[PDB]
Amino acid sequence: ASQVSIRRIKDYDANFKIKDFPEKAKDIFIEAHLCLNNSDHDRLHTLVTEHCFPDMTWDIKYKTVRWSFVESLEPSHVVQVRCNVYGQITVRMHTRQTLAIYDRFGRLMYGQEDVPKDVLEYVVFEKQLPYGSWRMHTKPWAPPKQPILKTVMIPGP
């Protein structure tokens, strides 16, 4: 498929455990989404780059998210990998999540507590090509969306 780009990965990394990559990806995924519920964003600094860390941390302050993982529907398999190169690797994942976000006053504003429900993801990890290690970097045709508990207004033009 894209072995030409993966030649750089083989040369630089010199380890390239292809089949272990899904395991590490799932581990970092669950870890990163595990520590969004404690205000302990310091490690989230090193689990995600500055490209998508500022949004993942600023739009969640004063919101008592309590995420959770319960199951992986089937094993996660790698996808096409392309590659003055930052190594971007895309992994497909069908997972089983629960999510219950709250406002800074403790009133539910999204999702239900247990409601263990399925999610489809096209996650993409990136890594400096050195000391910098694996970091989640990004996350669909038209899947449905769960509504918001709140009723809103959209003013006129």
Asked if 106 is part of the footprint of other proteins (rule: CB under 8 A), the reply reads yes
Residue 17 C-beta: closest distance to other proteins, Å: 40
Query: What contacts 24+ positions apart, CB below 8 Å, involve 75-78?
Result: 75/22, 76/22, 76/25, 76/26, 77/22, 78/18, 78/21, 78/22
124 in helix, strand or coil?
strand
Asked if 139 is part of the footprint of other proteins (rule: CB under 8 A), the reply reads no
Which tokens sit at 133? 């290690």
- For residue 156, CA distances in Å to 134, 152, 153 come to 45, 13, 9
Asked if 105 is part of the footprint of other proteins (rule: CB under 8 A), the reply reads yes
The rounded distance, in Å, linking the Cα atoms of 102 and 94 is 25
| Options 14, 40, 107, 141; binder of other proteins; rule CB under 8 A | 107
Asked if 109 is part of the footprint of other proteins (rule: CB under 8 A), the reply reads yes
Asked if 143 is part of the footprint of other proteins (rule: CB under 8 A), the reply reads no
Q: Report the site for other proteins in 1-60 (rule: CB under 8 A).
A: none
Q: Which is nearer to other proteins, 4 or 153 (CB)?
A: 153
Contacting positions for other proteins (CB under 8 A): 62, 64, 66, 100, 102-109, 147, 149-157
